[PDB]
Amino acid sequence: SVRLSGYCGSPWRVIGYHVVVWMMAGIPLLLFRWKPLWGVRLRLRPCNLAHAETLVIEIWQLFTVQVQTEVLRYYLFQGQRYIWIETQQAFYQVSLLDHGRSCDDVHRSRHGLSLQDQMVRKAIYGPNVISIPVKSYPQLLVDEALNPYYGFQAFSIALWLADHYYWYALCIFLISSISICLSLYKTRKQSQTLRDMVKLSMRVCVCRPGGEEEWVDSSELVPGDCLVLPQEGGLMPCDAALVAGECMVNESSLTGESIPVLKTALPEGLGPYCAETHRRHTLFCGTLILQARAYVGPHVLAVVTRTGFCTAKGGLVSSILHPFYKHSMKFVAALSVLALLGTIYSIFILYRNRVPLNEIVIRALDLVTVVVPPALPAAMTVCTLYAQSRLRRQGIFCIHPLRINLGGKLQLVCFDKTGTLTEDGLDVMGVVPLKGQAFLPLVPEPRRLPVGPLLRALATCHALSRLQDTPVGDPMDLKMVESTGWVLEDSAFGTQVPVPVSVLHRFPFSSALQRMSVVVAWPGATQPEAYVKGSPELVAGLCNPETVPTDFAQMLQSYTAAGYRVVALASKPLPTVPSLEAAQQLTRDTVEGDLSLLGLLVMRNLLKPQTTPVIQALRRTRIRAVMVTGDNLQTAVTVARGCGMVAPQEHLIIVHATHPERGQPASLEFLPMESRSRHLALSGPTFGIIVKHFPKLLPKVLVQGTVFARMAPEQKTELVCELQKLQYCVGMCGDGANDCGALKAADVGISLSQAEASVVSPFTSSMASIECVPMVIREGRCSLDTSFSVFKYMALYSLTQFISVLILYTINTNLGDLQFLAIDLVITTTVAVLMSRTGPALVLGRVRPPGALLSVPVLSSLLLQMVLVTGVQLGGYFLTLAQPWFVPLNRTVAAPDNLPNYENTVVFSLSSFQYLILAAAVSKGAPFRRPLYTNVPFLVALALLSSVLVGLVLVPGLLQGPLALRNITDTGFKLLLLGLVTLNFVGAFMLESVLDQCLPACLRRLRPKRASKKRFKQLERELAEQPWPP
Ligand SMILES: CC(C)CCC[C@@H](C)[C@H]1CC[C@H]2[C@@H]3CC=C4C[C@@H](OC(=O)CCC(=O)O)CC[C@]4(C)[C@H]3CC[C@]12C
Ligand SMILES: CC(C)CCC[C@@H](C)[C@H]1CC[C@H]2[C@@H]3CC=C4C[C@@H](OC(=O)CCC(=O)O)CC[C@]4(C)[C@H]3CC[C@]12C
Ligand SMILES: CC(C)CCC[C@@H](C)[C@H]1CC[C@H]2[C@@H]3CC=C4C[C@@H](OC(=O)CCC(=O)O)CC[C@]4(C)[C@H]3CC[C@]12C
Ligand code: ALF
Ligand SMILES: [Mg+2]
């Protein structure tokens, strides 16, 4: 359901809105960006939809759209046009304008569209272009830079500039500015790349009423134009229906398969033309026409049905354009409420301490920046930068490094079959000869055959030509001739190293007979030899019944039930004289009759050598591998059993759904096919029928579905989205244009292609194997572990500084600008960068990292470490006050005037060690990272900073002038402080170990969680309890 709200404008009201939102305050702009309803109710008056100039489109999601008048009122919502029909008084979508018009209606368009008609239809539908918007850098910045965090960072920078904290403000400002500039550049470059990808400019020939023909740009195409298709082929500029002639189309952009698809003219009937019902008569935008035949009439005719975004390619592009962090944000909000409480206490004590008002405000507001660290996201990003560098070294290119963290959450990866799991093209599996009347064993090496009829039939029965000293022609012909070892030189062929045979004539391959004929001869022969090659069931009807085996159909189906490309070959001795004076005057029908079937050639798309190891490694780590292919279900099932997606002990069930016809509803048919433990296999049609008519059975299908074949690109996207609705973290790995929606919609989409799929995918790999998936999963698990560690350190760091500054505020002192700077810059930056440094573990494990920062382990660790930190700091403070040499701090003045003093000195000396202790304690090794002792730079940095601090404590006058520290002459007290920090070190490491070891066991044995939050785990539970298909 949708709702259209109409708003006009008043100039006085427009100026009034602008002044009230600009001169009064800047906050109203952000308030209106957070809810645009108030902004549109203030700036625009409500107007009747017939006069509206602004519409609020709400689907809950709210959108605002400007209404454009040519007259023709219309608007664009997500690339789709909604023209205003005055007679019906509504904004009707242009996709529905000629919906349900008959096949005779399409056929009457074969004479073309006039110029007046084309102009009105271009006014209505627009140009035949997929127009992708590339925003300007200000327009692009308003989206990102208005992040709430960036506002908090701006507030903190302004505060630090008001507080003479210039250097850390400059560091934070530089980091944020470079990050924003990089994000803007990346987004604009990706937009420009996608725009260049979807752009299609070409000259097309359209029929015009009166018999004429006009060459126009493909953008001038409107629904109702009659395209004149080139006989030589080419890219299809729009969606069309064939009304005259036939075509051979490469539909890999829709299916991923380069096999030629035959398109025939639409049938003339009084029934509504449908792109799915008449898919075999429809030419889709972006697909490649290989050749077009005009049997009746001069030229091949197609009637334009959909242009622009209304094409299937346009729908895919629109889906691409218009589709841990939660707990991080909630923890930051909790840090903010703690900031409010600490600010109240700070105001109270500073007013007690007789601090001036402006200084009270500065201190209380600086406490907020203290407890909420402005440098948290950069610290979280450093680990993803390390992971991205490692991945680029391994050949995997990531455009957004923060997407790497999602690799640690993946429980399911979807795979395209062709080019991703299997090779791009077919390979010669063998040739099946015939001895006598029965089949022979399959011969994997056709050149190992003797020099007989079948070898020369494989070698010379084709239509290849030599070009650039390289054979060019039919691809399967090229591969079989490469297999035979014979080299091309009508034509002649030399054996692999026999007698070189020369072709005497050749009859072309026609799509009607779907078979080819040649006539060959050689010196030392008795008579010429004619070869025939084509569809095996069609060649079998021409040979003698005493040559075709009785097991022919069964063997052919056994071959083709696995997705093999069988092609038969036959031959004939001809009583013709061995001369071209009679051999070129043969009619082909006499050659096709009385054949002798020589055998079959079996071609298959082989599984890549890296596929089965990776799939078995994924299944061993309990990650679901799902085949989502555009190919047929038999090939998909065979490849899924081949790559180990379906183990031989496991059961596969085909789910077949039937459309609800007149009088009976849709039904689900389950047919178990002989060889988790239960896998489901279904087609695109079945997937759609289940999505529409069985929405309660759909989750079980998605939880048990392993093979999804014959899927359209939007169906791949829908599968990815429906699996994400089950709370899966979904990965997609594909290499085709039909995979772009699923690669953009997936959490981790890896592109095996460098063209037209690299644009929309977060990750691109230079290797054509799926070995990138375990690499990305390992790097993502390492990055998620490292990000947990860095977040825990920054939280502990924020709290430690909070406790320090509170203890010091209570006595009317502070830490010190240079002590603040040491802690903020030197310690914290060194620690964050060298924590993020370590790489991933070498082995994938079955257990994956936690994806929740609000977990009980994380919160318990933080709380206990902070208890120990607060205890050590308060104990050192109260031990300092108990000393005989201790003197109070002259509370009459405030910091930094009362510095140096013993209290700040001891508090800083303790907390500065605590930062390194917590840094070392939150860091982890196994199972998702390399061992912590291998991080030699980090350990050396910890030791060096510890030695610097031990010098600050022990060596008199060491940096005490700069850091405004007080000299303590009691060496026993300094040794007591060092023993206290050693206590904190040992206690922090023991706390981390005790938690990481015994907290899971206690959480399990104490309160058992029988039900997971994940929807798919609950579905797996209830399927284990009650298996759905009985
Ligand atoms: C406030 C200021 C002073 C902070 C400055 C911090 C920078 C010096 C940090 C932030 C990100 C760090 C980078 C994070 C990622 C990497 C990748 C790393 O290279 C690899 O990981 C290759 C490994 C492989 O391919 O096997 C080299 C260090 C480097 C550039 C780090 C260099 C130091 C950087 C630039
Ligand atoms: C007057 C005082 C308060 C100013 C201190 C100067 C800082 C700008 C210096 C002191 C310590 C320096 C840090 C020393 C250690 C590191 C780790 C280093 O990491 C790497 O080189 C990556 C190599 C790898 O991982 O392979 C990046 C620079 C950085 C953060 C340096 C950034 C600049 C720092 C913060
Ligand atoms: C006055 C100066 C010289 C003080 C020196 C302090 C050092 C003795 C501290 C600083 C950092 C500490 C290191 C911090 C962390 C590690 C990793 C830790 O390894 C493990 O926890 C096992 C599993 C894993 O590596 O993940 C072993 C101790 C060690 C080297 C610590 C050993 C003692 C170190 C070197
Ligand atoms: F390459 Al595919 F489905 F196998 F698009
Ligand atoms: Mg593919």
442/393 Cα distance (integer angstroms):
44
Q: Is the CB of 922 under 6 A from ligand 3?
A: no
Which tokens in the block code for residue 393? 């070294």
Q: How far is the CA of 978 from the centre of ligand 5 (A)?
A: 63
Burial class (CB in 10 A: 0-12, 13-18, 19+), 986: exposed
CATH, domain range 781-1006: 1.20.1110.10
Q: How far is the CA of 512 from the centre of ligand 1 (A)?
A: 64
Query: Do the beta carbons of residue 657 and residue 446 sit within 8 Å?
Result: no
Determine which residue's CA is closest to atom 10 belonging to ligand 3. Answer: 943
Query: Do the beta carbons of residue 114 and residue 208 sit within 8 Å?
Result: yes
Q: Using CA atoms in the order 160, 161, 164, 168, what is the torsion angle rounded to 10 degrees?
A: 60
| Region label for 224, one of left (φ > 0), alpha (ψ between -120 and 50) or beta (otherwise) | left
What are phi and psi for residue 784, nearest 5 degrees?
A: -70, -40
Strands 260-264 vs 438-439: parallel, antiparallel or unpaired: unpaired
Q: How far is the CA of 294 from the centre of ligand 2 (A)?
A: 73
| Of residues 520, 459, 522, 452, the one with CA closest to residue 485 | 459
Rg of the chain over all Cα atoms, to the nearest angstrom: 37
866/886 Cα distance (integer angstroms):
27
163/147 Cα distance (integer angstroms):
24
For 63, the enclosing helix (H) or strand (E) is strand 62-66
**SS3 category, 43:** helix
Which of 915, 933, 978 for mutating ligand 3's site (highest number of atoms within 8 Å of CB)? 933
Q: What angle do CA 266, 271, 277 make, to 5 degrees?
A: 60
Q: Is the CB of 990 under 6 A from ligand 3?
A: no
Query: What size, in residues, is the chain?
Result: 1030
SS3 annotation, 984-1020: HHHHHHHHHHHHHHHHHHHHHHHCCCCCCCCHHHHHH
Residue identified by tokens 């090779």 is 423
| Of residues 315, 414, 423, the one with CA closest to residue 750 | 414
| Of residues 973, 912, 987, 919, the one with CA closest to residue 947 | 912
| Of residues 937, 850, 949, 864, the one with CA closest to residue 906 | 949
Residue 823 per-residue DSSP state = I
- Distances in Å between the Cα of 658 and the Cα atoms of 210, 444, 661, 764, 902 are 46, 41, 8, 38, 84
7/47 Cα distance (integer angstroms):
5
Which tokens in the block code for residue 1021? 């539970």
Determine which residue's CA is closest to atom 24 belonging to ligand 1. Answer: 390
Q: Is the CB of 954 under 6 A from ligand 3?
A: no
Residues 262, 267, 272, 277, CA torsion sign = negative
205/230 Cα distance (integer angstroms):
9
Query: Do the beta carbons of residue 542 and residue 533 sit within 8 Å?
Result: no
Q: How far is the CA of 982 from the centre of ligand 2 (A)?
A: 25
Determine which residue's CA is closest to atom 2 belonging to ligand 3. Answer: 947
Burial class (CB in 10 A: 0-12, 13-18, 19+), 842: exposed
Query: Do the beta carbons of residue 681 and residue 709 sit within 8 Å?
Result: yes
Determine which residue's CA is closest to atom 3 belonging to ligand 4. Answer: 629
End-to-end Cα spacing for the chain: 38
Domain locations along the chain: 1-97, 203-321, 407-423+608-766, 427-604, 781-1006
Residues 416, 420, 422, 425, CA torsion sign = positive
Instruction: Write down the H helix ranges in 497-551.
Output: 536-539
Is 594 assigned a ligand-binding role in the annotation? no
Determine which residue's CA is closest to atom 13 belonging to ligand 3. Answer: 939
Residue identified by tokens 């206990």 is 864
Architecture per CATH, domain 427-604, reads as: 3-Layer(aba) Sandwich (3.40)
Q: How far is the CA of 829 from the centre of ligand 2 (A)?
A: 7
Report, in this order, helix, strand and coil percent for the chain, each rounded to 5: 45, 20, 35
For 179, the enclosing helix (H) or strand (E) is helix 166-198
What are phi and psi for residue 64, nearest 5 degrees?
A: -125, 135
Q: Using CA atoms in the order 230, 232, 238, 243, what is the torsion angle rounded to 10 degrees?
A: 60
| Of residues 273, 251, 261, 264, the one with CA closest to residue 294 | 264
Q: Which atom of ligand 3 is nearest to the CA of 925?
A: 26
Strands 73-77 vs 68-69: parallel, antiparallel or unpaired: antiparallel
Catalytic residue status for 416: yes
767/777 Cα distance (integer angstroms):
16
Burial class (CB in 10 A: 0-12, 13-18, 19+), 762: buried
Question: Which amino acid is present at 29?
Answer: L
**SS3 category, 270:** coil
Determine which residue's CA is closest to atom 28 belonging to ligand 3. Answer: 933
Which of 316, 417, 424, 639 for mutating ligand 4's site (highest number of atoms within 8 Å of CB)? 417
Query: Do the beta carbons of residue 502 and residue 490 sit within 8 Å?
Result: yes
Helix-helix angle 902-922:936-954, to 10 degrees = 160
Q: Which of 98, 225, 416, 477 is catalytic?
A: 416
CATH, domain range 203-321: 2.70.150.10
CATH, domain range 407-423+608-766: 3.40.50.1000
Q: Is the CB of 931 under 6 A from ligand 3?
A: yes
Q: Using CA atoms in the order 778, 782, 783, 784, what is the torsion angle rounded to 10 degrees?
A: 100
Q: Is the CB of 96 under 6 A from ligand 3?
A: no
Largest Cα–Cα separation, the chain:
127
Query: Do the beta carbons of residue 980 and residue 872 sit within 8 Å?
Result: yes
Q: How was this structure determined?
A: cryo-EM
Bridge partners, 502 (sequence order):
492, 521
Question: Which amino acid is present at 487?
Answer: V
| Of residues 90, 60, 89, 94, the one with CA closest to residue 77 | 94
21/662 Cα distance (integer angstroms):
60
**SS3 category, 470:** strand
Residue identified by tokens 């003045």 is 893
From the CA of 921, the nearest ligand is 3
For 683, the enclosing helix (H) or strand (E) is strand 678-683
Query: Do the beta carbons of residue 508 and residue 498 sit within 8 Å?
Result: no
Question: Which amino acid is present at 561?
Answer: A
Q: How far is the CA of 825 from the centre of ligand 2 (A)?
A: 8
328/405 Cα distance (integer angstroms):
13
- Distances in Å between the Cα of 307 and the Cα atoms of 15, 69, 127, 128, 275 are 40, 21, 8, 5, 13
Residue 216 per-residue DSSP state = E
Bridge partners, 260 (sequence order):
250
Q: Which atom of ligand 4 is nearest to the CA of 256?
A: 5
Which of 376, 386, 831 for mutating ligand 1's site (highest number of atoms within 8 Å of CB)? 386
Query: Do the beta carbons of residue 681 and residue 636 sit within 8 Å?
Result: yes
For 215, the enclosing helix (H) or strand (E) is strand 212-217
* CB half-sphere exposure, 218, CA atoms < 13 A: 20
Q: How far is the CA of 833 from the centre of ligand 2 (A)?
A: 8
Residue identified by tokens 């910045």 is 141
941/934 Cα distance (integer angstroms):
13
- Distances in Å between the Cα of 832 and the Cα atoms of 161, 182, 377, 793, 836 are 24, 21, 11, 8, 6
For 480, the enclosing helix (H) or strand (E) is helix 475-484
229/233 Cα distance (integer angstroms):
7
Q: Which atom of ligand 3 is nearest to the CA of 929?
A: 26
Q: List all residues whose CB is within 6 A of at least one atom of ligand 1.
A: 171, 382, 385-386, 389-390, 393, 829, 833
267/270 Cα distance (integer angstroms):
10
Q: How far is the CA of 721 from the centre of ligand 5 (A)?
A: 20
753/767 Cα distance (integer angstroms):
9
Q: List all residues whose CB is within 6 A of at least one atom of ligand 2.
A: 821-822, 825-826, 829-830, 833-834, 837, 937
Determine which residue's CA is closest to atom 5 belonging to ligand 3. Answer: 943
788/324 Cα distance (integer angstroms):
9
Question: Which amino acid is present at 205?
Answer: C
Q: How far is the CA of 824 from the centre of ligand 1 (A)?
A: 19
- Distances in Å between the Cα of 714 and the Cα atoms of 195, 333, 350, 709, 719 are 20, 38, 62, 13, 9
Helix-helix angle 357-371:325-352, to 10 degrees = 150
Q: Which atom of ligand 2 is nearest to the CA of 386?
A: 25
Q: Is the CB of 932 under 6 A from ligand 3?
A: yes
Query: Do the beta carbons of residue 169 and residue 161 sit within 8 Å?
Result: yes
Please report, for the chain, how many H helices and E strands are present, in that order: 33, 40
Q: How far is the CA of 834 from the centre of ligand 2 (A)?
A: 9
Burial class (CB in 10 A: 0-12, 13-18, 19+), 259: middle
Count the Cβ atoms, other than its own, within 10 Å of residue 321: 18
Q: How far is the CA of 999 from the centre of ligand 5 (A)?
A: 46
Q: Is the CB of 942 under 6 A from ligand 3?
A: yes
668/658 Cα distance (integer angstroms):
7
Which of 175, 396, 833 for mutating ligand 1's site (highest number of atoms within 8 Å of CB)? 833
Is 739 assigned a ligand-binding role in the annotation? yes
Residue 963 per-residue DSSP state = T
50/34 Cα distance (integer angstroms):
28
From the CA of 839, the nearest ligand is 1
Bridge partners, 203 (sequence order):
217
Q: List all residues whose CB is within 6 A of at least one atom of ligand 4.
A: 256, 416-419, 629-631, 736, 738-739
427/609 Cα distance (integer angstroms):
14
| Strands, sheet with 300-306, edge to edge from the N-terminal-most edge strand | 212-217, 203-208, 226-229, 300-306, 239-244, 282-283
Burial class (CB in 10 A: 0-12, 13-18, 19+), 449: middle
Q: Is the CB of 60 under 6 A from ligand 3?
A: no
Which tokens in the block code for residue 303? 């009637």
Determine which residue's CA is closest to atom 3 belonging to ligand 2. Answer: 822
Q: Which atom of ligand 4 is nearest to the CA of 636?
A: 4
Q: Which atom of ligand 1 is nearest to the CA of 174?
A: 1
Determine which residue's CA is closest to atom 16 belonging to ligand 3. Answer: 933
Q: Using CA atoms in the order 677, 683, 687, 690, what is the torsion angle rounded to 10 degrees?
A: -80
| Of residues 1006, 1000, 946, the one with CA closest to residue 978 | 946
Determine which residue's CA is closest to atom 23 belonging to ligand 1. Answer: 390
For 85, the enclosing helix (H) or strand (E) is strand 80-85
